Design a binder for these strands. Structure first.
Ligand SMILES: [Cl-]
Ligand SMILES: [Mg+2]
Ligand code: NA
Length: 174
DNA sequence: ACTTTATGAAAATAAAGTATAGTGTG
């Protein structure tokens, strides 16, 4: 099985539909009655160095999907499946910051379990997805995250180095 | 490399916006 880790950028106006999608169990200590957009805006406002307002097209967070193939999870019981997602959340907390993980919500139902984890790209007083998740950082995640998971006893191959596959969705795959 | 944004105000500037790297299923 391959580790599946991929991100999507979320602006204010994407965060609303994702909060509703995800009411599922939530691994962070977030207050489950405050919206993603309000939680992240308070946090950035309360900490950013700059006195300018957050730009209207800011990436407020990088939503990572973490999962693998169906048969990988058939091999795990529910305790071990939960620890798989907690272990993955630990990797991103240690490398990007504890207080940046705004949500880590796991779907555990009809399909293969998938976690949607919102990582705020706030480093050094500055909100910038561009600075945190650049081409080199993404290469490094595809190499290093599967190695970390294997060290915790979850046997995962890294994705094909320089893979030429394109991201597909069900509608487009038809 | 190029464009959009926020700024006590630009006939202008800097910081962050645009993808990125990766597989799933049947
Ligand atoms: Cl928006
Ligand atoms: Mg299972
Ligand atoms: Na240029």
């Amino acid at each position: 099985s391959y580790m599946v880790a991929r991100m999507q950028k979320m602006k204010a106006g994407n965060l609303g539909g994702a909060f509703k999608h995800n009411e599922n169990y939530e691994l962070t200590d977030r207050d489950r009655s405050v919206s993603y957009e309000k939680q992240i805006k308070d946090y950035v406002n309360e900490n950013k160095v700059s006195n300018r307002a957050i730009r209207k097209d800011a990436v407020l967070c990088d939503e990572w999907i973490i999962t693998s193939d169906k048969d990988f999870f058939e091999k795990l019981d529910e305790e071990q499946t939960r620890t798989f997602f907690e272990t993955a959340k630990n990797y991103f907390a240690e490398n990007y910051g504890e207080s940046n993980i705004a949500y880590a919500s796991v779907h555990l139902d009809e399909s293969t379990p998938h976690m949607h984890m919102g990582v705020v790209p706030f480093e050094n007083g500055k909100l910038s997805s561009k600075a945190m998740f650049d081409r080199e950082e993404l290469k490094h995640i595809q190499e290093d995250l599967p190695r970390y998971m294997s060290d915790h006893g979850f046997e995962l191959e890294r994705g094909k180095l320089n893979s030429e596959a394109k991201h597909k969705t069900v509608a487009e795959f038809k």
